[PDB]
Design a protein around this ligand. Sequence first.
Ligand code: VGT
Ligand code: VGT
Ligand code: ZN
Length: 258
Amino acid sequence: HHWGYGKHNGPEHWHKDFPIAKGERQSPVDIDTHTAKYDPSLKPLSVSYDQATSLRILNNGHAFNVEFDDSQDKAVLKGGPLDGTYRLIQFHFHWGSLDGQGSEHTVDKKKYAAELHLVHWNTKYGDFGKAVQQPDGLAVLGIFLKVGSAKPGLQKVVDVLDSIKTKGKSADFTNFDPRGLLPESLDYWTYPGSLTTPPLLECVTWIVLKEPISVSSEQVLKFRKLNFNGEGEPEELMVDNWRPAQPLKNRQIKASFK
Ligand SMILES: NS(=O)(=O)c1ccc(SC[C@@H](O)C[Se]c2ccccc2)cc1
Ligand SMILES: NS(=O)(=O)c1ccc(SC[C@@H](O)C[Se]c2ccccc2)cc1
Ligand SMILES: [Zn+2]
């Protein structure tokens, strides 16, 4: 058996193999917008993706990852709450079976249809596997998706999903520009947290953008045609691959904006 998002292996079970699931800085969380304090000392985010090199897209059985060449400083996140340089390694999404759920973070308990995670690692630790062992090892840029108008920059991702339907499938995915997934504003909330899947390591500076991106109903319907299963196995649609909000405990969510 293995962790997943089913009735028998979902988030309420993860603590049995990953006891840090009940830890002091777990993600995601509810963002209470009235309780978040504006921190005028936070810097604007610097998102430098013009030289991003996408390589491949992979169905890992839990989501799909768009992977980048992170062997050099090609696509980096700096500024905001961060010290130093964080290199883009991959992005992925979490989404629902219906439009009223799917995001991992919530905003005043509102769930969005989906959530994009752009995963970056702190270059002072040399590699991703070292960085996840450190409290400031990762920076994940989270962007909410709502259903409305299509996102034109998402369609190249949507159109390749039929080629990676099942767990373990990958496809070449070069020249994808992740700037096409951003909203107009880089206003954000930030707090110290964790990976939202096992192994749930407490290594993430979360940066969650206030402005959602709009995607079309047809775009998210295509995410929901993916499979958790491998080829030839009984079909289990890849939907509701989100962890619910965890206790905030002794943490403060800071806002970049008034
Ligand atoms: N999250 S975790 O790592 O602590 C973990 C590890 C192992 C397990 S046992 C899971 C199995 O009993 C049942 Se799957 C099933 C459900 C419906 C239909 C067919 C088969 C659960 C969670
Ligand atoms: N949803 S999320 O953005 O918080 C997120 C981001 C990245 C992951 S990578 C999970 C595992 O494949 C790699 Se952890 C590992 C890697 C090397 C050595 C030890 C442990 C998980 C969740
Ligand atoms: Zn994620």
